[PDB]
């Protein structure tokens with residue numbers, strides 16, 4: 001009697017979900033729904049099933065994990081899947097979450113299913129800690145930094161600069177800003193003080209390195225506001241040391257108690273593989289959604305509504321005995 | 325609007341009183357002391373003798389037990405829970421299963437809800453231990469205790485012979501902390517994570533100080549740690565060791581299929597441990613108030629409470645601001 005999981009999208013995240021499931025004995029992978037012609041994408045990968053056949057699994061999948069491979073799926077179609085299954089997604093457009101919730105709630109609701117939106121680390125785990133922090137320390141500041149990680153957008157930008165063969169960009173929290181937050185001295189940070197950007201560029205033969213550097217550093221919207229460093233490297237080093245699959249970040253609540261005493265709470269992640277971690281979180285929440293659906297819960301939910309006890313396959317007593 | 329009653333007025337109780345002031349949606353109804361009426365009327369303030377607890381029925385939504393004493397809670401807890409929704413910070417991990425059972429039985433009878441073992445540990449750290457092993461099933465969880473007093477160990481020493489008053493500190497080892505943070509995965513011994521430093525005021529007859537080294541051999545308390553010992557005057561203990569600060573770390577180091585290193589960390593750096601613990605109790609009282617109005621009865625732990633219940637903001641507001 002294991003939890004039957006369905007995967008939609010076979011990009012890095014779906015690949016990770018399939019992986020995570022192996023680390024979860026109480027779960028089985030029923031199928032991987034893809035758009036690519038399964039016929040040519042091998043056949044020994046017995047779990048692969050074409051997206052056109054999704055509906056045929058309406059009764060064999062307990063939780064459908066949406067790992068949409070960037071397109072219309074990775075934002076629009078989950079609503080179509082919620083109409084048929086209990087789902088879990090990591091919709092990451094913070095500004096549009098209120099709307100995504102509205103829509104998903106209606107569907108999952110009248111369909112009698114349950115849909116979990118925006119889980120992962122941010123949104124997801126960082127969200128939970130932002131809430132915990134301001135809930136426990138009502139008087140204070142909340143600072144979220146996004147650990148060393150790539151920005152697809154900024155990388156494409158770098159590529160539009162004259163004389164740039166190829167390149168990559170990283171956003172990195174500034175240590176000095178972290179140290180001050182970690183100290184109880186409450187304060188607000190300017191954009192320039194929280195994060196710095198680091199680019200590794202492969203120049204064309206003869207290109208005007210100093211020009212490229214400034215073209216990137218003074219680039220409006222993307223870099224103008226941040227201290228940016230440009231390192232020039234070869235195509236070999238680019239491929240070897242900048243796969244760009246890692247990430248991390250910090251959530252810090254710097255506050256004071258009534259008497260004025262300093263109190264600091266911090267939560268952070270260091271991810272060698274950002275995608276595999278997100279997937280692991282997706283799977284864990286799948287366990288929670290399964291329980292919830294069985295309890296007969298309906299509508300859309302966020303990690304903000306789920307007790308941590310639901311993320312574990314252990315019983316209530318085992319937890320209170322082992323972890324409390 | 326949430327009417328809070330404080331039971332006990334030590335450091336935590338004082339802390340709850342202050343924290344209530346940081347919550348516009350909450351009101352302090354009274355502070356219950358064990359002190360004899362033989363005080364000074366009430367000395368003004370919100371102080372009320374414990375004997376009058378019964379009288380506040382239907383005028384208190386949540387009783388926050390700031391008694392401070394695991395053993396006292398064993399009996400007093402059920403007592404209160406039979407009359408009010410309660411919130412305590414029962415900190416004896418080893419006996420939490422028993423406390424839950426007792427509090428559960430009672431609270432269900434009276435139709436009330438009792439939240440036990442909240443605080444930073446048990447409480448917040450328990451939450452992260454769970455989150456940690458839930459997201460990274462394959463890995464190792466390590467908990468450290470920042471640098472501060474370890475109350476229990478402070479009494480165990482006060483029970484020693486030639487000692488009449490003393491204090492101890494628990495201190496994480498930078499070396500252990502870094503390894504944990506390296507996603508290297510491994511097992512640590514008690515002696516590898518923390519060292520103990522004691523400060524004791526002896527002399528019950530200038531008593532044998534070297535036999536006071538019967539503290540370093542104390543089973544379950546020291547001996548498992550490199551325990552450094554010092555002796556001082558009780559003036560040098562009040563104006564030098566008002567150990568209010570404390571902190572800790574919960575590190576989950578693990579690997580996802582394929583061996584990629586994944587590290588999660590939660591830590592606290594508290595200038596005033598008690599006050600922090602107090603803010604946690606209040607935040608959770610809000611959650612208990614809500615569950616209460618929803619009709620939940622019986623005992624619960626932080627593991628059963630959705631984080632959204634700790635905030636006075638609405639669900640739509642949280643999704644918009646924090647999600």
Ligand SMILES: CC(C)C[C@@H](N)C(=O)O
Nearest residue numbers: 070150151152153154155
């Ligand atoms: C839209 C995202 C996939 C990439 C964007 N956050 C960026 O880094 O530009």
